[PDB]
mmCIF file with all atom_site columns, C-alpha atoms and ligand atoms in Angstrom:
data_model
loop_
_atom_site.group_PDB
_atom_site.id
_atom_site.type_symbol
_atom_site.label_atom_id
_atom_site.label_alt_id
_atom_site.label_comp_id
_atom_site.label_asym_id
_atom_site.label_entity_id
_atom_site.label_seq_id
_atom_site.pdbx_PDB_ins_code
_atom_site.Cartn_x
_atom_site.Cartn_y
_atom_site.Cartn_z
_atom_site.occupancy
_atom_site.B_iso_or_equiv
_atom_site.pdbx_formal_charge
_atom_site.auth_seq_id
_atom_site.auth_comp_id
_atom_site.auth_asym_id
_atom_site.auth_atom_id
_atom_site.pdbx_PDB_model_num
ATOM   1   C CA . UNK R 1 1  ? 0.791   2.808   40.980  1.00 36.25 ? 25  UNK R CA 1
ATOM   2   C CA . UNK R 1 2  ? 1.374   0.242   44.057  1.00 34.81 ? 26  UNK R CA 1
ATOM   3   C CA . UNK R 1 3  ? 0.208   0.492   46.865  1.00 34.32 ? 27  UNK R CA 1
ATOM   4   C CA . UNK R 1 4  ? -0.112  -1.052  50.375  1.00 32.37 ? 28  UNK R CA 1
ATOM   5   C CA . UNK R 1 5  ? -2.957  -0.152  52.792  1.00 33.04 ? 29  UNK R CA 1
ATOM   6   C CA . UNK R 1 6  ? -2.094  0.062   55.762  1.00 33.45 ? 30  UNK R CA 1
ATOM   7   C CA . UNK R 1 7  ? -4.031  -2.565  56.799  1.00 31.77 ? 31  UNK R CA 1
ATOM   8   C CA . UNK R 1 8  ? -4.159  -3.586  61.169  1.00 33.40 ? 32  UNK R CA 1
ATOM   9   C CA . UNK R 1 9  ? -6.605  -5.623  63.379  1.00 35.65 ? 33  UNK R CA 1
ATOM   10  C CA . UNK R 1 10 ? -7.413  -2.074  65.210  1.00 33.85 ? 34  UNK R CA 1
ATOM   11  C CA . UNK R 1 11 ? -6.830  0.823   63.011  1.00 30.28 ? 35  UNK R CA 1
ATOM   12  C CA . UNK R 1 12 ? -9.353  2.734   60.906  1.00 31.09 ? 36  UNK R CA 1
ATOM   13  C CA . UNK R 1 13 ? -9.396  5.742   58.264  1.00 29.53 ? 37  UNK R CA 1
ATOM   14  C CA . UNK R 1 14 ? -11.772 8.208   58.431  1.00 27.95 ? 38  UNK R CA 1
ATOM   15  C CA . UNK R 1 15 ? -12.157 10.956  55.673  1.00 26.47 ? 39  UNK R CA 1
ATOM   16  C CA . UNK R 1 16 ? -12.132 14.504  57.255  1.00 24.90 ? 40  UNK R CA 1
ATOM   17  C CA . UNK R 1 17 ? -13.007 16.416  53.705  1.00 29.34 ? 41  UNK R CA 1
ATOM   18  C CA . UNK R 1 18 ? -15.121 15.672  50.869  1.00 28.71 ? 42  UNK R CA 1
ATOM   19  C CA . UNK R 1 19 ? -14.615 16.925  46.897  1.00 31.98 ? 43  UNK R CA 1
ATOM   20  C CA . UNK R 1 20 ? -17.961 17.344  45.730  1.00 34.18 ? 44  UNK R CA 1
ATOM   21  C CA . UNK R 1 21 ? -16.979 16.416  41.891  1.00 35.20 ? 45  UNK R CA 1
ATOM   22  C CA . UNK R 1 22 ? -19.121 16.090  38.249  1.00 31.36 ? 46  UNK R CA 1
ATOM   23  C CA . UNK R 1 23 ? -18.378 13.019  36.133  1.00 31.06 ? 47  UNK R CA 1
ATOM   24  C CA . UNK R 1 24 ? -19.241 12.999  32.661  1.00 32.40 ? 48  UNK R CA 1
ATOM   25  C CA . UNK R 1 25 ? -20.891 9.802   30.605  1.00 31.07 ? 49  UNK R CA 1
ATOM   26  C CA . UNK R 1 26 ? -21.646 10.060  27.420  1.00 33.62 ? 50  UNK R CA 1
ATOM   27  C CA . UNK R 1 27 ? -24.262 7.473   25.277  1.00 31.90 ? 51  UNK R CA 1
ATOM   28  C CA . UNK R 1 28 ? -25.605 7.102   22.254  1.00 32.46 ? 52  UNK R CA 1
ATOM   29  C CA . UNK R 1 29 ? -29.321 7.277   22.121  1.00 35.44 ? 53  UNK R CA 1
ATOM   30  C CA . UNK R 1 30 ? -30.645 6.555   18.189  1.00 35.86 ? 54  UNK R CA 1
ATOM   31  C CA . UNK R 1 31 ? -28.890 6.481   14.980  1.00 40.18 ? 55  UNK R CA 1
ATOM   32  C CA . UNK R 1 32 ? -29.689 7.568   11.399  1.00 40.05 ? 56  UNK R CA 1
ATOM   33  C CA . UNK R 1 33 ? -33.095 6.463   10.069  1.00 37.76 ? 57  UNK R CA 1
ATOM   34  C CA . UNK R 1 34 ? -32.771 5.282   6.336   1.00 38.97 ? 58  UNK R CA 1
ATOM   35  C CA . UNK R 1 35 ? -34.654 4.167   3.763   1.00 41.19 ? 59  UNK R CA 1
ATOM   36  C CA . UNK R 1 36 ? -34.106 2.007   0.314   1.00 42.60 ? 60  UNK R CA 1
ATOM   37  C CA . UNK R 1 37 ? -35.829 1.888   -3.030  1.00 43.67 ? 61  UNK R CA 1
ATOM   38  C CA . UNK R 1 38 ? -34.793 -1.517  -5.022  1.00 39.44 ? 62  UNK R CA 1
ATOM   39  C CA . UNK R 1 39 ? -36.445 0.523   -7.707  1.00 42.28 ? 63  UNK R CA 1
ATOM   40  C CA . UNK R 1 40 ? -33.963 2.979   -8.016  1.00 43.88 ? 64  UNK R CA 1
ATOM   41  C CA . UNK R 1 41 ? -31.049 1.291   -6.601  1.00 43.71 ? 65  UNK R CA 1
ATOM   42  C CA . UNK R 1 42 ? -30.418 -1.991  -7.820  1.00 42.16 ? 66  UNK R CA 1
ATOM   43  C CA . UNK R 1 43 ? -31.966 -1.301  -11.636 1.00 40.06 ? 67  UNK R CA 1
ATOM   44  C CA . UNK R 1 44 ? -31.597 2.045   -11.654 1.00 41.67 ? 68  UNK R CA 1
ATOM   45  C CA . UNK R 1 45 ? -34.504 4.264   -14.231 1.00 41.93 ? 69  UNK R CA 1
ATOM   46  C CA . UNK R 1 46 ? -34.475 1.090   -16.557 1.00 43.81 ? 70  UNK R CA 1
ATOM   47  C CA . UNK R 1 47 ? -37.335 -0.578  -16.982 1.00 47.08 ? 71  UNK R CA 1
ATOM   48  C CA . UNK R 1 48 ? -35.899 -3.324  -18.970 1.00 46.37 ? 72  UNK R CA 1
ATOM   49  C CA . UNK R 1 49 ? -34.282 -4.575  -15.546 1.00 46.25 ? 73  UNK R CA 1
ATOM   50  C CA . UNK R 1 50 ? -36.780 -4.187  -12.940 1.00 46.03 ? 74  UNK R CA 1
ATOM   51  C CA . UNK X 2 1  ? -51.253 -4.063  4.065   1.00 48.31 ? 211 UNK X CA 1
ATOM   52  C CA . UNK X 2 2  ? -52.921 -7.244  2.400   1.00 49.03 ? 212 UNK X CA 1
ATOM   53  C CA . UNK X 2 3  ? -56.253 -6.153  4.288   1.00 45.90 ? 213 UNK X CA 1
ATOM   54  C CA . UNK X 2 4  ? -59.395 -4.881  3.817   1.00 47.75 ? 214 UNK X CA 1
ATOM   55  C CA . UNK X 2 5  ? -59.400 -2.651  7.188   1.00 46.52 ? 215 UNK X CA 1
ATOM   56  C CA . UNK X 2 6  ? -56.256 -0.194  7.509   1.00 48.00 ? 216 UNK X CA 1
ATOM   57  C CA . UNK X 2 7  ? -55.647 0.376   11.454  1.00 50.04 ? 217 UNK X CA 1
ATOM   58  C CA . UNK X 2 8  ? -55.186 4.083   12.140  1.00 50.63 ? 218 UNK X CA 1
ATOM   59  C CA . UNK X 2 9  ? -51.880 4.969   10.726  1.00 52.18 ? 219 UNK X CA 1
ATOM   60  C CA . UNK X 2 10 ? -48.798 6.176   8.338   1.00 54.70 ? 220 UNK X CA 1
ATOM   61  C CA . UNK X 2 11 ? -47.892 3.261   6.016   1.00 54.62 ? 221 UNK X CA 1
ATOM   62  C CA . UNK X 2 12 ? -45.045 3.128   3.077   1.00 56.88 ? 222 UNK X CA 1
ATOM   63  C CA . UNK X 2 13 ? -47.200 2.353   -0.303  1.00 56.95 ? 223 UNK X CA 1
ATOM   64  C CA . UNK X 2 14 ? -45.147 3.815   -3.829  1.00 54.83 ? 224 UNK X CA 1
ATOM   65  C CA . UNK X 2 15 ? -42.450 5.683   -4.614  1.00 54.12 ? 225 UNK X CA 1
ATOM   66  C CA . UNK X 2 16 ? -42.959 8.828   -6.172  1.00 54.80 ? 226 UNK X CA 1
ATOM   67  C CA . UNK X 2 17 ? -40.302 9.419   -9.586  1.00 52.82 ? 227 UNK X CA 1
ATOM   68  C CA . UNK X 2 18 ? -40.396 12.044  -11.521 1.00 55.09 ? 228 UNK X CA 1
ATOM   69  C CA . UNK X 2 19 ? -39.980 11.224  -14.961 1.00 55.18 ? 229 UNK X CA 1
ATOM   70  C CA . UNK X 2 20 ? -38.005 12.523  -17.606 1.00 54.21 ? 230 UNK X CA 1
ATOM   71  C CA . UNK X 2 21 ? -39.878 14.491  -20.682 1.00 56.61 ? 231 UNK X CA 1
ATOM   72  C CA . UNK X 2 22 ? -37.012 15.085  -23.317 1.00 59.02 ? 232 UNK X CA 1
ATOM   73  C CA . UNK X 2 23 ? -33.805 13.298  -23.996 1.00 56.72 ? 233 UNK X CA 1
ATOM   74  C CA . UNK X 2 24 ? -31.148 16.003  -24.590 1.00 55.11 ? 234 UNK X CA 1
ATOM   75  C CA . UNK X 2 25 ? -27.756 15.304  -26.825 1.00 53.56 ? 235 UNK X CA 1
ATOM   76  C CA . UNK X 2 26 ? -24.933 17.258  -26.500 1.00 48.35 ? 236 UNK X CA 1
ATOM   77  C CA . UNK X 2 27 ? -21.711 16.726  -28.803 1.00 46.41 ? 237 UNK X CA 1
ATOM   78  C CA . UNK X 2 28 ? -19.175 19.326  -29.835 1.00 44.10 ? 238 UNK X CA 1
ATOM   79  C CA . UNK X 2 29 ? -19.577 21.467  -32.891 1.00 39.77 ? 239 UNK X CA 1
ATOM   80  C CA . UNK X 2 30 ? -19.462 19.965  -35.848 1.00 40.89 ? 240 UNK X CA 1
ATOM   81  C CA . UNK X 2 31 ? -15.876 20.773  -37.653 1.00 41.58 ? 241 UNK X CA 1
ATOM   82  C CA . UNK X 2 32 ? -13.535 19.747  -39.993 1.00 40.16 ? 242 UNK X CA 1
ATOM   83  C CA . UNK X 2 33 ? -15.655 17.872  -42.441 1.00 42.88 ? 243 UNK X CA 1
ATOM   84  C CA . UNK X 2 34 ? -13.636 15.552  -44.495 1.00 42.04 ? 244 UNK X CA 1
ATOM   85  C CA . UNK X 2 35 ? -12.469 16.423  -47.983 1.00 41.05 ? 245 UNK X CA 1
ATOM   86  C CA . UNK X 2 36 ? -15.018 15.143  -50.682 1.00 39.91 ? 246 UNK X CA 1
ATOM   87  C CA . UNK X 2 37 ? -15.453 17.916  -53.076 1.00 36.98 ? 247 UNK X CA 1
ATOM   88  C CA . UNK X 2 38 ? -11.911 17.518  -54.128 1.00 34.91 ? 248 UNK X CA 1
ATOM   89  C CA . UNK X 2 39 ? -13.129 13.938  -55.158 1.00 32.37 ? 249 UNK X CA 1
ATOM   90  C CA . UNK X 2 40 ? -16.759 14.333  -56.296 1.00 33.43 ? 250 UNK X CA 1
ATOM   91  C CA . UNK X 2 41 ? -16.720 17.516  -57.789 1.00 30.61 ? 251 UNK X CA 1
ATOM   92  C CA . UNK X 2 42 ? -13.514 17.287  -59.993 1.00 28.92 ? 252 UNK X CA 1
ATOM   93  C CA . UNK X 2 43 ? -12.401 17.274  -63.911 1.00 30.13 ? 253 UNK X CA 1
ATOM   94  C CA . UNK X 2 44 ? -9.269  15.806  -63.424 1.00 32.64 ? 254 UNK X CA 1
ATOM   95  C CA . UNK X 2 45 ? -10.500 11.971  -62.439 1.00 35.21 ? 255 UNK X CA 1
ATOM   96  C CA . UNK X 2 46 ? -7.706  9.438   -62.540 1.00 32.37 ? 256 UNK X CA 1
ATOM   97  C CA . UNK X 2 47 ? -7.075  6.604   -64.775 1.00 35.43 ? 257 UNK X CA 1
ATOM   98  C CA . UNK X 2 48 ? -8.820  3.426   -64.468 1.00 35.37 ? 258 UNK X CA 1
ATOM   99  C CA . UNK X 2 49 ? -5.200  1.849   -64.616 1.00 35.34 ? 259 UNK X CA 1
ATOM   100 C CA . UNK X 2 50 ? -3.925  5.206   -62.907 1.00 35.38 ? 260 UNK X CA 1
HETATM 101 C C1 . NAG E 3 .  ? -3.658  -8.312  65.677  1.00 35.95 ? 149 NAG E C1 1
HETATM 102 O O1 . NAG E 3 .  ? -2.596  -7.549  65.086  1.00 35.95 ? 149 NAG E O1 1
HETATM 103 C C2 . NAG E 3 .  ? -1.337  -7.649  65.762  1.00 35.95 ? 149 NAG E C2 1
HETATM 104 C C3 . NAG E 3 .  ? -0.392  -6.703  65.059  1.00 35.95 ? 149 NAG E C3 1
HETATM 105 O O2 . NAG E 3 .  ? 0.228   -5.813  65.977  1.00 35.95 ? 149 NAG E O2 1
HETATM 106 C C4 . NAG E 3 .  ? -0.863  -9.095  65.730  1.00 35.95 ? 149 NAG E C4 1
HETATM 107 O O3 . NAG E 3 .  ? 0.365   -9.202  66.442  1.00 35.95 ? 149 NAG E O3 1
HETATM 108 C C5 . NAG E 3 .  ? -1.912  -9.996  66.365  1.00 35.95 ? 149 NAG E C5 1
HETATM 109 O O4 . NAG E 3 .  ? -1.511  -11.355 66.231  1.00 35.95 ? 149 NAG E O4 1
HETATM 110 C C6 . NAG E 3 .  ? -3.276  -9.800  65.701  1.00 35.95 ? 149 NAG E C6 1
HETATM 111 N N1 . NAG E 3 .  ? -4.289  -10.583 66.388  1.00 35.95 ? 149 NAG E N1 1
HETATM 112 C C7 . NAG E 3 .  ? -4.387  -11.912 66.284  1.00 35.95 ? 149 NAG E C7 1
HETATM 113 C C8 . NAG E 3 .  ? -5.487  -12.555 67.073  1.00 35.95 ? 149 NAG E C8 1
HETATM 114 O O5 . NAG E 3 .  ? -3.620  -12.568 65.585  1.00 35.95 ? 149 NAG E O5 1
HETATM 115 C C1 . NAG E 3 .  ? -11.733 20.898  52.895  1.00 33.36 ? 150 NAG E C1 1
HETATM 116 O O1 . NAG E 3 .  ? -11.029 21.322  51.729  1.00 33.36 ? 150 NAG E O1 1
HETATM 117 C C2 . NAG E 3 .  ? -11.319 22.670  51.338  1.00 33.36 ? 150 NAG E C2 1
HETATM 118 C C3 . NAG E 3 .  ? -10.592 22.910  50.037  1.00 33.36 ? 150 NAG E C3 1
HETATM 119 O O2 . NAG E 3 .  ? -10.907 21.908  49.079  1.00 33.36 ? 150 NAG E O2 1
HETATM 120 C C4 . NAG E 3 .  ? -10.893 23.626  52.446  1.00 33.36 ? 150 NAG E C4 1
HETATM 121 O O3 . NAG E 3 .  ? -11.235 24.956  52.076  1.00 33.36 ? 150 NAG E O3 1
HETATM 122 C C5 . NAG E 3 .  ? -11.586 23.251  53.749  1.00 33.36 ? 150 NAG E C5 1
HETATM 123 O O4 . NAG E 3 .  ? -11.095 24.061  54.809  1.00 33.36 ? 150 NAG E O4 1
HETATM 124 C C6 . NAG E 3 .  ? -11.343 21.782  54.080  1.00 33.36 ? 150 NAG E C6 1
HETATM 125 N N1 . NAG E 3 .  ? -12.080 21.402  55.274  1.00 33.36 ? 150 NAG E N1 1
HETATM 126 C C7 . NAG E 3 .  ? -11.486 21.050  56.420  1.00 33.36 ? 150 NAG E C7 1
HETATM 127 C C8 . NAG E 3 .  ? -12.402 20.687  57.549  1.00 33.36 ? 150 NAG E C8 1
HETATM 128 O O5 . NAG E 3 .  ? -10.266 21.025  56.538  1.00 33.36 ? 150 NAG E O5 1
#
């Protein structure tokens, strides 16, 4: 939205009220924790290809 | 570790597998056996030209 303050060389704003409000953030902290075996994985319970 | 002296510790050495004992075969059952009785046990044999 525009907007134009209404900026002068002798006028001020001054809040009367206050909203006391609750933001929300969200972050990640850790992931999954994995593990491999070459063993299994890439030849697979044969010993010929190990 | 490549060492003689292991620091106080959890380390990653093997990886436990169990191990198959028998190798199971499964195929369907065994049906419609092909006709050789009509060939081997028979009176009526051909003709060596016929
Ligand atoms: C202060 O603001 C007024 C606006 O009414 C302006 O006319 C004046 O020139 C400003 N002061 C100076 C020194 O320019
Ligand atoms: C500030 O706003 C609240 C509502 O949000 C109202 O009850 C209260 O009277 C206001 N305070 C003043 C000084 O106007």
């Amino acid at each position: 939205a525009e907007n134009s303050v209404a900026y002068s060389n002798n006028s001020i704003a001054i809040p009367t009220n206050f909203t006391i409000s609750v933001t929300t953030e969200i972050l990640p902290v850790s992931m999954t924790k994995t593990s491999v075996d070459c063993t299994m994985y890439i030849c697979g319970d044969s010993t010929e290809c190990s | 570790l490549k060492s003689f002296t292991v620091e106080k510790g959890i380390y990653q050495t093997s990886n436990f597998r169990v191990q198959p004992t028998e190798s199971i075969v499964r195929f369907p059952n065994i049906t419609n056996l092909c006709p050789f009785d009509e060939v081997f046990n028979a009176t009526r044999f051909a003709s060596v030209y016929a």
